[PDB]
Amino acid sequence: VVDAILDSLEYTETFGEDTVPYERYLTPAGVALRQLRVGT
Amino acid sequence: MRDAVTSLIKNYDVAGRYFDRNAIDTLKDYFDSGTARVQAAAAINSNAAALVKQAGSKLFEELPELIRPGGNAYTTRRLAACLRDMDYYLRYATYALVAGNTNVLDERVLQGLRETYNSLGVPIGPTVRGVQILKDLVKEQVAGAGIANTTFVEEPFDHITRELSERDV
Amino acid sequence: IVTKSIVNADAEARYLSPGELDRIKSFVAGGQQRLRIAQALTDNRERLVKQAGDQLFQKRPDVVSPGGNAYGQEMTATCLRDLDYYLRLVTYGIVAGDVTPIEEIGVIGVREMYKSLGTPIEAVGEGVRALKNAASTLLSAEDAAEAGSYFDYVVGALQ
Amino acid sequence: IVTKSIVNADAEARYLSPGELDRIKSFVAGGQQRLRIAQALTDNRERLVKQAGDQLFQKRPDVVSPGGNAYGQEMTATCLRDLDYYLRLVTYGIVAGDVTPIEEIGVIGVREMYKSLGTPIEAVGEGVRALKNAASTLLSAEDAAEAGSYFDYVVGALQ
Amino acid sequence: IVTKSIVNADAEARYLSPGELDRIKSFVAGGQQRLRIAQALTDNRERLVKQAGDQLFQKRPDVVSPGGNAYGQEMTATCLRDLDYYLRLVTYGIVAGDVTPIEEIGVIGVREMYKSLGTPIEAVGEGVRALKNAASTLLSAEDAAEAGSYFDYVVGALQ
Amino acid sequence: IVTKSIVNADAEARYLSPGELDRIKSFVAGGQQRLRIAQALTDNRERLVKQAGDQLFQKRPDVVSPGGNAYGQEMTATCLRDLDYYLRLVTYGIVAGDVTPIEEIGVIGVREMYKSLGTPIEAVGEGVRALKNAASTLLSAEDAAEAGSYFDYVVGALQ
Amino acid sequence: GPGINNQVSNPSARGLAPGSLGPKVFKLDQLPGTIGKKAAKGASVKFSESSTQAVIKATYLQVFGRDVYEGQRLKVQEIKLENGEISVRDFVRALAKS
Amino acid sequence: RLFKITALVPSLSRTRTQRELQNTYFTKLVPYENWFREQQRIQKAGGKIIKVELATGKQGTNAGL
Amino acid sequence: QDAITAVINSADVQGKYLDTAALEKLKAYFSTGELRVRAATTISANAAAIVKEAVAKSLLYSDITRPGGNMYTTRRYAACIRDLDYYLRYATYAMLAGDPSILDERVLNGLKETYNSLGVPVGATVQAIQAIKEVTASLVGADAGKEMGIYLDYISSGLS
Amino acid sequence: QDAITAVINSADVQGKYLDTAALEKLKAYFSTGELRVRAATTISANAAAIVKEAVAKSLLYSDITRPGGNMYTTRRYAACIRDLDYYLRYATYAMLAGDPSILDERVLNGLKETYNSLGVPVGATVQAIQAIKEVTASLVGADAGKEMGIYLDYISSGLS
Amino acid sequence: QDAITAVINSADVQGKYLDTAALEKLKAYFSTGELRVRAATTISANAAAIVKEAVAKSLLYSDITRPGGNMYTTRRYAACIRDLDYYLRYATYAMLAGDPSILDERVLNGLKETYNSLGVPVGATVQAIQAIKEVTASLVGADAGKEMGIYLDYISSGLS
Ligand SMILES: *[C@H](C)[C@H]1/C(=C/c2[nH]c(/C=C3N=C(/C=C4\NC(=O)C(CC)=C4C)C(C)=C\3CCC(=O)O)c(CCC(=O)O)c2C)NC(=O)[C@@H]1C
Ligand SMILES: *[C@H](C)[C@H]1/C(=C/c2[nH]c(/C=C3N=C(/C=C4\NC(=O)C(CC)=C4C)C(C)=C\3CCC(=O)O)c(CCC(=O)O)c2C)NC(=O)[C@@H]1C
Ligand SMILES: CCC1=C(C)/C(=C/C2=NC(=C\c3[nH]c(/C=C4\NC(=O)[C@H](C)[C@H]4CC)c(C)c3CCC(=O)O)/C(CCC(=O)O)=C2C)NC1=O
Ligand SMILES: CCC1=C(C)/C(=C/C2=NC(=C\c3[nH]c(/C=C4\NC(=O)[C@H](C)[C@H]4CC)c(C)c3CCC(=O)O)/C(CCC(=O)O)=C2C)NC1=O
Ligand SMILES: CCC1=C(C)/C(=C/C2=NC(=C\c3[nH]c(/C=C4\NC(=O)[C@H](C)[C@H]4CC)c(C)c3CCC(=O)O)/C(CCC(=O)O)=C2C)NC1=O
Ligand SMILES: CCC1=C(C)/C(=C/C2=NC(=C\c3[nH]c(/C=C4\NC(=O)[C@H](C)[C@H]4CC)c(C)c3CCC(=O)O)/C(CCC(=O)O)=C2C)NC1=O
Ligand SMILES: CCC1=C(C)/C(=C/C2=NC(=C\c3[nH]c(/C=C4\NC(=O)[C@H](C)[C@H]4CC)c(C)c3CCC(=O)O)/C(CCC(=O)O)=C2C)NC1=O
Ligand SMILES: CCC1=C(C)/C(=C/C2=NC(=C\c3[nH]c(/C=C4\NC(=O)[C@H](C)[C@H]4CC)c(C)c3CCC(=O)O)/C(CCC(=O)O)=C2C)NC1=O
Ligand SMILES: CCC1=C(C)/C(=C/C2=NC(=C\c3[nH]c(/C=C4\NC(=O)[C@H](C)[C@H]4CC)c(C)c3CCC(=O)O)/C(CCC(=O)O)=C2C)NC1=O
Ligand SMILES: CCC1=C(C)/C(=C/C2=NC(=C\c3[nH]c(/C=C4\NC(=O)[C@H](C)[C@H]4CC)c(C)c3CCC(=O)O)/C(CCC(=O)O)=C2C)NC1=O
C-alpha cells in the first residue's frame, strides 16, 4: 500500500523527489470545523 | 410527494420567477395527456386482481427455483407475501400513472426497499423480473381498451426497475 | 463510447473537443450496422454455444475428462452457460461501440474468480475463440470483422 | 494524436482504448484533408504573413512607433519572421493533430522570453489573430474553422 | 425565393418549370435550419452590435474623430442603430432565402443616401464585415457559412 | 510579516529562531515610518487616482477608444475605482510590511478575472506604474523608495 | 492554497506553489558534506547542515503528525539521508515501512 | 540488494525558479525491490540514466540475497 | 452512465433480454443524438461568453461583488467563474449522455456540504445557474435549450 | 516521438514548413498505419501465448533454467517472463509509432548496465527476442511481421 | 453554354445516349462545383479591390496615365476601370460555368476591332489582365486560381 502510494504519478509529479509531503486538500466537514468557529 | 403540475411549481419557486412559455408548454402537454391517463388507469384498475395472479404464474414459469426448496416463494405463507408485493407495485404504478411523475415511486416505494430486501433475505432480481411481467400484462390491457400510445403506461414500471436495479454498469 | 469521451474531457477542465464530437457523430452513423450485427448474434445464440462447445471439447478434452472441472452434465451445462454469458457480453460491447460495458461485467476480476473455481482460463479463451469462429461463419465479411473485434478483446482479456 | 494517446495510456497500466483507436482512425481519415490545408498554407506563406503584419500595424501602431520595439527595417523584418515562425508552427499543429509541436517549439516558455526581449505579448497575440483572420479568408469555410481553431490555441496560449 | 421563380416564370408565358419546383421543395426543406439561424442571430443582437462597433472603431477611428460623422454620443448611437438595421435586414434575408427583401430595404438606394448624409460607405462596409466576423464567432461552421453568405452580399452591396 | 515568520517556523517543529525575532524587532522599530507613509498616501488618494488616470489615458488611449473596455463615463469611473482599490491594497502592504495581505486580495486570481472581464492586464500594470510615479513625486526619497517597493510588487504581479 | 489551481481544475498546475494560504513546504537543499573542491574539510560552523536537519524534523512532522519520542528516531535512515544517497521520497518510503 | 544509480531528468514542464539541482542530477542508493519502479519513473520522465552499479549485492546468489 | 447504459442496466438486473420498449428508448436516443451533438458543439464554442453574460446578468453590480459580499476578493471572483464553468461543462456532459447520473456522481455529491462550509450563498448560485440556462437556451435554440435547461435545473434543484 | 513528430522536428530544424516531400512521407505513414492498427490488435490478442511459445522454443530445457543458471529461481523466471512481455509490448508501441526512438529512450537507456550488473547473459536474451520475432512473424503476417521484426531486432542490437 | 450543356450537345449531335465518359465529365463537374461556388463568392466579395490592386501593379505611374497616354483623360481612366471590371466579371461567369464559350460570345467577339479602332494599347491590356490574374490567384488560393487564370489567359490570348 505504501509502495503503491509512492509509486503513483500523482505523488512524483506534484511533490517531487526532494520535497517533504504536506497537506494539500481537506474535507468539507474538515474546513467546517476549522474556519467557521468563534474566531474565524 | 410532487405532482407533474406541482413539480413545475417547485422548480419555478426555487428560482423565484413567474410562469414562462415553456412551463405552459409542458402544462399543455400534461393537460391533453390527462384524459388518456385517466382512462388507462381505469382499465388497469378494473382487471388488477387477475393481473397479479397471471404475473405470479409467468414469474414462476420463468425461474423454477422461486417455488422450490431453496427459494423464497416456498409455502403459502411465503407466497402470499410475494403476491401482495405484486399488488403494491401495481398500485403505486397506477398512482404514478395518474400523477404523471416518478416521484411517487421514488418517495413511497423505492426509498427503503434495499433495506427491507437485504434485511429479510428477499432477492432483488426476481422482483424486478416480476415487475416486468406486470408491465407486459398491463401494456396488453391498456392496448385492449382503446388507448393507442402506451409509453406513459410503460415508464413508471421501468423507473421502479432502474432504482431497484443493482447497478453493475 | 460517449461515456469514454465524456470522462476523458471531464478529467480535464476543457469541454468536449470537436474531434471527439466527430467520433461521436461517426459512431452515431454506424449504430445501425451495430444494431443489425447485435440482432444477428442475438437470435442465433444456441447455435453459437453449440458450435463453441463442439470446437472446445474437440480441442481440449480435459474438461470432459473427470479430473477437469466440466465433468458431468451439470458441470458441462454450467460451462455452456458461461459461454452464453460471454456471448451476451460480446453483444453488449458490439452495441456500446467500446469495450467498457463488457470489461466491467466480464473481464475486470475474472482471473481470481476462475482461479478460485478451479477452471483454467486458457480453455475459456479457446471457447471464446470458437465463438469467434462460429460467428465469423455466421456473418458477412464486414460483419465478422467487427464482431471478431470484440471477440478478440475477450480472448486477449482472458489470457 | 498518437503520442498523446500513447502517453495517456502509459500513465495508466492499460492498453489503448477502443475509443482512442476510433480517434486514431478518424484522424487518419481526416489526415488527407489536413495535408491539403497544409499545402495551401505552405504555398500562401508570403502574402499571409505580410497581410497579417500590416493588419497588426494598422491595429497597433505602438510597436512601429519610435518608442516601440519594432522600429526600423531590421526590427520589423524580425517581426515578420516571428509571424512566419508562428504560421509554421500552426501548420505543424494542423498536420499533427496535437498541439504538442506548437507547444514544445513555441508556446511553453514564450512569456519569460518576450519579457526579457522588451516585446509586448499582446501585440504578438494580435498578429497571430490577424494570421487567423487572413488564413480564414483564404481557405474553405469549415476548413477555415479547422485552421483557425489551432490559430485560436496559439492566440489564447500566447496571452 | 418563391417570388423570384414566380416572376421569372411570369415574364415568360410558361408555367413554373419543375426544376424551379425542385428548388422550392429544397428551400422548403432547408427552412428549419434557416429559422434556427435567424433566431440565433435574433436573440443575440446587442452583442453583435457591440462587437461590430468595437471592431469598427478600432479599425477606423475617423468616425470617432470630430471631423467624421459619428462624433459624440448621439451620432455614435445613430451609427450603432444603423448597424442594428443592417443586422435586422440580414435576418430577413436569411429567412427569405434570397436577397430580394433585404436589397429592397437596404441596398437599392443606399449610396446617394449616405452621400447626402456625409458618411463614407466604406466604413459601413467594414461595420457589416465586423458583424459577419462576430456572427461567425457566434455560430457553428455550417451556420456561419450560411450567414456570411448574406453578410457578404451586404458588404459587396455597400461597396 | 509576523504571520510569515510564524507559519515559517510553524511548518518546522522548531520555535521562532532569534534571527526572526531580530527581524520582527526591526520591523517593530520601522513601523512608525510605515504608518506615516501610509497616512501620507491615505489622505492624498484622489490626487493619485487623478494623476494615474492622466498618465494612463495619455499613455494608452485604447481604453478611451470605443473598442476598449473603459469607454464612457461609467466604464472610466469603474477604471478609476479599480485604481483606487489598488492604491488601497498598496497602503495595506505598506503597513503590513510584507506583501501577503495585498496579494491575498488583489493578485492571487487577477489574471483570469481581468481575462473574463475583457480588460487587458498591461494597461492595469501601466496604471499602477503611474500611481508609483505620482506617489514618488508626492513623497520624499526614502519614502518614495519604500512605497515604490510595494508598487513595484503590484506592477510585477499584474504582468 | 490558492483556489484557482484546484486539481479538479488545472491538471496542468499540479507542481505549482502552495501559495501563502497553504502550509510551508520543505525542499532539501544544500546537502551537507559537499564543501567545495579544494582540500579543506576542517571547518566547524558549516551553516548548511543546520538547515538540513530541519527537513528531517519536518518529515517526522508530516508522516507521523507529531514529533517522535527520543528513543524512536530512525537514526540509520537519518544519517543515510544526510550522507547523500537516500533521498527525501526514499526516506519517506523507509519511514512509512517502520 | 542496493543499486548505486546516477541519472539526469530534464524539465519538460514549465521552468522552475527553484533549483531542483538535486532533482535534475542525482546519485542515490536504491534498494533492489524499489529499483524497477523507480527506474520506470525515470523511464517515464524521459531522463537519461548514466551509471548503474550494484553496491551491496553479489550476482547469482540464490539464497540469502 | 448513459441513456444506453441505463437501458442496458435496467434490462440486465431483471435478466431480461432487450424487449421492444428498450429498443424504442435506444432508437429515440439515436434520433435525438443529432441535435445533442450540434448543441454540444456550439456550447463548446463560446462557454466563456456564456459565463460572462451570466455574471453580467445576475451577479454583477450587486452587493455580492461589493465589499462584504462573497465575490469581493479577486480570488473569489476567479473561483466563481470556475464554479460556473464547471456547471456549464458538466451540464454539457449530461446533455450529451442523455442521463443526469454524472451530475449526481461528479458535481452534486458533496456540494451543499462545501457551500455551507465556505459560507457560499446558495440562492445567488441558483440565480446564476438560471441566468446560465437562459443564455444558453437563447444561444442554442429552444429545442436543445429544453434539454440543456433540464440538467441545469437538475443542478439548481439538487443545490437547493 | 512518432514518425509524424519526427517529420515535424526535421522540418523545424530546417526552419521551413511541411511541403510536398514531408507530405508524401505522411501519406506513406497513413497507408501503413491501417495494417499497423490491425497488427496491434492481433498482437494484443495473444501476447501471453507469444511469450510462452518463445520461452518454450528457446529458453526451456537448457543450462540457464537448470540449477546453476540465471533462470533457475522462481523470481528469476518471473522476471524473465516480464522482460519478454516488455520487449513485445514496447516493440508494439514502436511499431505503432513507426519510430524506434521512443523504444530506445524507454528501455535501451539503462538495460545494458542493468544486465551487466546483475550478471544476466546477453546472448540468451538475443535468442529469446529472435524467438519472439519468429513467433510474431508467424502469427501476424509477412509485412507486419517484418515491421515488428525491425524494432525487435533494434532491441536485440541495442542489448548487444 | 455550360460544361453540362456542352456535354449534352456533344452527345446530342451524334444522336448518342449519355455514355459513361459523358457521365464521368458531369460527375467531375459536380465534384469541382464546390470550390467553383466558393471562389465565385470570394471574387464577388472584393472585385473593386482586385481592380485597384491590378492598376496599381501594372498601369499606374507609367506613361499611360501621363499626358499622351491612353489613360490620361479621366473619362478614359473610368473606361479603363470599366473594362477591367468586365474582364473580371466575365471570367467569374466562365469559371462558374466551367466553359469559356460565354467569353467567346460576349467579350471576345468584336473586341480587337474596337481596341484597334479606338487606338487602345493591346499589350498594356494584356499586362493588366495578367496582374488581375496574379491578384485573384493570390486572393482565392492556388487550386481555384488555376481555373481563374485559365479563363483570364483565354481573354488575354484571344485579345492578342
Ligand atoms: C390437485 C389435485 C393436487 C395439487 C395440485 C396443485 N398444486 C398447485 C400449486 C401450489 N401448491 C402449493 C402448495 C403448498 N403450499 C404449502 O404451504 C403447503 C403445505 C405443506 C402446500 C401443499 C403452492 C405454494 C402452489 C403454487 C406454486 C406451485 O406451482 O407449486 C398446482 C398449480 C396451480 C396453478 O397452476 O396455479 C396444482 C395443479 N395439490 C393438491 O393438493 C392435490 C394433490
Ligand atoms: C415477490 C415478487 C418477491 C418476494 C417477496 C416477499 N416479500 C416479503 C416481505 C415483505 N415485503 C415488504 C414490501 C414492501 N413494504 C412496503 O411498504 C412497500 C412499498 C409500498 C414494499 C414493496 C415488507 C414490509 C415485507 C415484510 C412483511 C410485512 O409486510 O410485514 C416476503 C416474506 C419474507 C419472509 O420469509 O417472511 C416475500 C417472500 N419474494 C420473492 O421471492 C419474490 C422475488
Ligand atoms: C457474466 C459474468 C460471469 C462469469 C464470467 C461467471 C462465471 C462463473 N462460472 C462458474 C462455474 C463454472 N465455470 C466453468 C467453466 C468452464 N468450463 C470449462 O472447463 C472451461 C474452463 C470454462 C468454460 C468453457 C465450470 C466447469 C464451472 C462449474 C465449476 C464448479 O461447479 O465448481 C460460476 C459458479 C456457478 C454459477 O453460479 O454459475 C460462476 C459465477 N458468472 C458470471 O456471472
Ligand atoms: C519558433 C518560436 C520562436 C519565436 C516566437 C522567436 C522570436 C524571436 N524574436 C526575436 C526578436 C524580436 N521579436 C520582435 C517581435 C515583435 N514585434 C512586436 O512588437 C510584436 C509584438 C512582435 C511581432 C510578433 C521584435 C521587434 C524583435 C527585435 C528585438 C531586438 O532585436 O531586440 C528574437 C531575437 C532575434 C532573432 O534571433 O530573430 C527571437 C529569437 N524565436 C523563435 O524561435
Ligand atoms: C433599414 C434601412 C435604413 C438605412 C440604411 C438608414 C440610414 C440612416 N442613417 C442615418 C444617419 C447616420 N448614419 C451614420 C452612419 C455611420 N456611422 C459611421 O461613421 C459609419 C459611416 C456608419 C455606420 C457605422 C451617422 C454617423 C449618422 C448621423 C449623421 C447625421 O446626423 O448627419 C439617417 C438619418 C437619421 C435617422 O433618421 O436615423 C438614416 C435615415 N435608415 C434606414 O432606415
Ligand atoms: C480590490 C480587489 C478588486 C479588483 C482588482 C477588482 C476588479 C474589478 N474590475 C471590474 C470592472 C472593470 N475594470 C476595468 C479596468 C480597467 N480600465 C482599463 O481599461 C484598464 C484595463 C483597467 C484599469 C485602469 C474596466 C474598464 C471595468 C468595467 C468592465 C465592464 O463593465 O465589463 C469589476 C466588475 C465591476 C465591479 O463590480 O466593480 C471588478 C470586480 N474588484 C476588486 O474588488
Ligand atoms: C464540479 C463541481 C464542483 C464545484 C461547484 C466546486 C466548488 C468549490 N468552490 C469553492 C470556493 C468558492 N466558490 C465560490 C462561488 C460562489 N460564491 C458566490 O458568491 C457565488 C454565489 C458562487 C459563484 C457562482 C466562491 C466565491 C469561492 C471562494 C471561497 C474562497 O476560496 O475563499 C471551493 C473551495 C476551494 C477552491 O475553489 O479551489 C470548491 C471546492 N468543486 C467542485 O468540484
Ligand atoms: C540555482 C543554481 C542552479 C543553476 C544555474 C541550474 C541550472 C540548470 N540549467 C538547466 C538547463 C539548461 N541550461 C541551459 C543554459 C544555456 N544554454 C546555452 O547555450 C548557454 C551556454 C547557457 C545559457 C547562458 C539550456 C539551454 C537548458 C535546457 C536544455 C534542454 O532543453 O534540455 C537545468 C535542467 C532543468 C531545466 O532548468 O530545464 C538545470 C537544473 N540549476 C540550479 O539549481
Ligand atoms: C520496461 C523496460 C525495462 C526492462 C526490460 C527492465 C528489466 C529488469 N530486469 C531485471 C532483472 C532480471 N532480468 C532477468 C532476465 C533474464 N535472465 C536470463 O537469463 C535471460 C537472458 C533474461 C530473460 C529473457 C533475470 C533473471 C533478473 C533477476 C536477476 C536477479 O535475481 O537479480 C531488473 C532488476 C529488478 C527486477 O526486475 O528484479 C530490471 C530493472 N526494467 C525496465 O524498466
Ligand atoms: C465585355 C467586353 C467589352 C469591353 C472590353 C468593351 C470595351 C470598350 N472600351 C472602350 C473605351 C476605352 N477602353 C479603354 C481601356 C484601355 N485603354 C488603355 O489604355 C488600357 C490598356 C485599357 C484599360 C485596361 C480606354 C482608356 C477607353 C477610352 C477611349 C475613349 O472613350 O475616349 C469602348 C468605347 C465606348 C465606351 O467605353 O463606353 C468600348 C466599347 N466593351 C465590351 O463590351
What does this protein structure show overall?
The PDB classes it as photosynthesis. The entry lists the keywords photosynthesis. The structure is cut from a larger assembly and holds 2 copies of chain A, 1 copy of chain B (169 residues), 4 copies of chain C (159 residues), 1 copy of chain H (65 residues) and 3 copies of chain I (160 residues). Chain A has 40 residues and is mainly alpha-helical. Helix content of chain A is 45%, strand content 5%. The longest helix of chain A is centred in the last third of the chain and has 8 residues, at 28-35. Chain A is elongated, with a radius of gyration of 15 Å. The termini of chain A are far apart. With 169 residues, chain B is mainly α. Helices cover 71% and strands 0% of the residues of chain B. Chain B is built from 8 helices and no strands. In chain B, helix 3 (48-62) packs across helix 4 (76-99), helix 3 (48-62) crosses helix 7 (125-144) and helix 7 packs antiparallel against helix 8 (151-164). The longest helix of chain B has 26 residues, at 21-46. Chain B starts with 5 loop residues before the first helix and ends in a 5-residue tail after the last helix. Chain H is of the alpha+beta class and 65 residues long. Chain H has 2 helices and 3 strands, in the order E-H-E-H-E. Chain H has helices at 21-24, 32-44, and strands at 2-8, 25-31, 49-54. Chain H has a 3-stranded antiparallel sheet. The longest helix of chain H has 13 residues, at 32-44. Chain I has helices spanning 3-12, 20-45, 47-59, 74-97, 101-106, 111-117, 122-140, 142-159. In chain I, helix 2 (20-45) packs antiparallel against helix 4 (74-97), helix 3 (47-59) crosses helix 4 (74-97) and helix 4 crosses helix 8 (142-159). The longest helix of chain I has 26 residues, at 20-45. Chain I starts with a helix and ends with a helix. Classes of the chains: A mainly alpha (40), B mainly alpha (169), C mainly alpha (159), H alpha+beta (65), I mainly alpha (160). Chain D binds chain J through residues 2-3, 6, 15-16, 21, 24-25, 28, 31-32, 35, 38-39, 41-42, 45, 87-88, 91-92, 95-96, 100-101, 105, and chain J through 1-2, 4-5, 8-9, 11-12, 15-20, 23, 26-27, 30, 33-34, 37, 40, 44, 93, 96-97. Strand 1 of chain A pairs antiparallel with strand 1 of chain G, so a sheet runs across the interface. One phycocyanobilin is lined by residues 10-11, 15, 19, 21, 24 of chain H.
